[PDB]
């Protein structure tokens, strides 16, 4: 298993890392019909999302899904500063893959 | 898929975004027979609600509702401020599709 | 729908609205065999619960109750304070069917 | 339905309630095979748990068990004090039943 | 049942106790397809996973694999200090069986 976000990046075709070293700045949350999704933006203007699992999403990733949605509501609501966000760039806007915070000094 | 809950909302019929740019002032929950929805208002006067989950629903929007109705009262409860609201006007009162939170604040 | 919890009350045999406006006083949660639920009490005296899941109560409503303990766990532990209770008074106990906070400060 | 914590421990056999008065002292939790449980300390010395679910119990109390440990885990991240504790006391360590919090106790 | 998570570590072949005493240095997780995990970091540069769910574990863990994860990323947002931590040094990263977390500092 990798022991690191950038290295689980790695494993997959069109992902890519973004160093985001910020709080969340906008959440966004549908539960409208086929639209079922979270939308994140920061101050930089990147946005990204957590789409639909909308016809194709293994089993595995079901709950994942629900749980990364969950991490981006209480990351924004504590103002918690993500790292890094592994991405698939093959999307508009870029689904959301793995996340990444690191609580640097202050030990 | 939209980068925006207005975009979003610009997607389905009978929807319309309402810029709330407030914290919620009351939050209604009720697990009675047929009636297990949720109710917020805002100081503006306006009442919005999580409809009950019945036909007009699908399958995906079944987990949706429960996470909407997390949110809102979550979002209560921390006092943080909603932005807009993509909400269908042609029910009452007019309820929620999607929610938009900005942190300005920083 | 309706748009309070007072209205809701009122769709309703057997219930009845109690102004509440106080924090509760006490969290008590059970997972004893068959009296798997929740009672609240406040510095009023007053008692309350979030009875078993039995036959009273019907199918999608299962969640509404998971919902309705999980809120007042969270409600308890944030002190945060209860406007209104829609209950029902046929039961010993009060049952709770709706519940209402807001927050009136800034 | 019973009242009080004390009042739902006197309905079963090998139950007891102990005034515990103090916050965890320490929250063990395991996902191992076959201890998949929950491990609570006090300063007092006392050690309990929320034991392994399996067939003593029946099916009501299964979401009833995640409740407990839910609870237990959010009691002890945000320190608050339990008064009482109704458990079983013919298991090692003592299985928890119900748990019981006052807030605003002075 | 054990009383201590280092009891519980004993029940168990390639498992062993890290005296963690630190708060967690990293969060990491991921929805991404067959690496549906968690990885924590800590500053004496110790990481751990919570493994992805297939034939290792038992219909008994597949729930408490998401409270391990569940209590791993409020245990990180919430700065608490994590005491030790029973992993499988047979994995790698190690995977986490069970934590333990102690009170009178955190």
Same mark, same amino acid.
């Given at each position: 298993?990798?022991? /690191?976000? &950038? =290295?689980?990046?790695?494993?997959?075709?069109?992902?890519? *890392?973004? +160093?985001?070293?910020?709080?969340?700045? /906008?959440? &966004? =949350?549908?539960?409208?019909?086929?639209?079922?999704?979270? *939308?994140? +933006?920061?101050?930089?203007?990147?946005?990204?999302?957590? =789409?639909?699992?909308?016809?194709?999403?293994?089993?595995?990733?079901?709950?994942?899904?629900?749980?990364?949605?969950?991490?981006?509501?209480?990351?924004?609501?504590?103002?918690?500063?993500?790292?890094?966000?592994?991405?698939?760039?093959?999307?508009?806007?870029?689904?959301?893959?793995?996340?990444?915070?690191?609580?640097?000094?202050?030990?």
């Amino acid at each position: 298993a990798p022991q /690191s976000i &950038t =290295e689980l990046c790695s494993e997959y075709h069109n992902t890519q *890392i973004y +160093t985001i070293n910020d709080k969340i700045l /906008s959440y &966004t =949350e549908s539960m409208a019909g086929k639209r079922e999704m979270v *939308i994140i +933006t920061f101050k930089s203007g990147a946005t990204f999302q957590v =789409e639909v699992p909308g016809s194709q999403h293994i089993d595995s990733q079901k709950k994942a899904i629900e749980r990364m949605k969950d991490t981006l509501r209480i990351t924004y609501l504590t103002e918690t500063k993500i790292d890094k966000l592994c991405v698939w760039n093959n999307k508009t806007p870029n689904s959301i893959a793995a996340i990444s915070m690191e609580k640097l000094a202050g030990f």
